[PDB]
Amino acid sequence: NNCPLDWLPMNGLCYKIFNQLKTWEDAEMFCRKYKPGCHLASFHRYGESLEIAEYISDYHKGQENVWIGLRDKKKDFSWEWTDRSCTDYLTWDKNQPDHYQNKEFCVELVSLTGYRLWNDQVCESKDAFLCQCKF
Template sequence: MDRGSETMGPVAYFSLCLLGCLIFNPSLAGAQDVSCPRGWLPFQGYCYGYFTQEKTWMEAEAECQHHGPEAHLVSIHSAGENNMMSYYIKRYHKKNSPVWIGLWDLEQGKRDDEVGQSPTSASASSGA
């Protein structure tokens, strides 16, 4: 293997791991009976969308923003939201590959925008 191939290895692996985008869009939230776009999942007054295009974290976050100024990769804040996301991902994401989500910094009370600079591994559990 030449030096060029060794250099491309991690880059190729990183881009292949970035499948899926789960969007949380508070601007689509409203009353109890929220009306979400077709194919989106309503949950507790918010809309969640799942997309399978291969993207980096930054590209996935930018894609989410195309759906509304306050749309972001989802940050999970409760056990109920975690269970719903786990079910939703298992139902629609048939591949055994990662899905991007956003992360929330509890100490600073804001999105952790430095997340996505490198891959993070975690497993989701439905609690069942």
Template sequence: MTAAWVILTVTSVLFAAREVSSHNDECSNGWTSWKRNTELGYEYKMICWKDYVSEDVALKRCREERADLASIHSKDENDFVTDVAYGVGMSFKSGLKVWIGLHKNKHGGWEWSDGTAYDYKNWDDKQPDNYNGHETESPEDCTQIYSSGKWNDLKCNGLVRKCVCKREWIPLEMEKFK
């Protein structure tokens, strides 16, 4: 009887722990500010899923937060987004892919989903490569950021479980005038 109780208890605890983690799609401590000392800055948040999600699902989730997938416009911002994506002290570590908001437009050029200028790039070696040049087989029209901060083009329905969202930070005193 005691052995059966121990097995049942251990199984229940493991199942409960698994259930809690599977329902938590936010894997950060809320929004993290960048350049908050300026009149208008930005804040970032990482979102995680138990299962893989497409770039469209990630973008929709960011927009539910009045945000967009992260756009990056400088080395400093790239370093900051990388820290948000991989340095939050959680169970997701490097090796998992993270969506950012860079994707190909209908003319084949790159653009940010928030409409800001494509004025900075940090592609990994030999990237973007559009699936090693096999565009007709599997076009890679979206972008992930590695734990190194380098970027990789990826299919928009790629195997990704995380994204970084970005929105303007507005001081509370300015918020009441909007």
């Protein structure tokens, strides 16, 4: 009804992991250009993080990390979602975010954590990615 068969429906939106590897920026443009009304995913509750993590664990083969829509463009710990939603929830991995070497401003789901925790990472890294769309 709300979403096509191969998309995860949650709180009015539809989510899908893509196994293809891309930079954070390339992943966002792809989601946006996939169908009108799409972006890399934004998270707003713990239940979402867990339902999403399990979904990726079941539908994604490999240990590659997954890009999500959070980023720090101003480069000063002001994380914002590409979909323009509120940053009213977080779940950083242990010791994150750390702006490692001052080159990490794009967020990724950490494979080692069952895709449940976030990590700021180099945007030029090649990760799989999670799109979020309205249908």
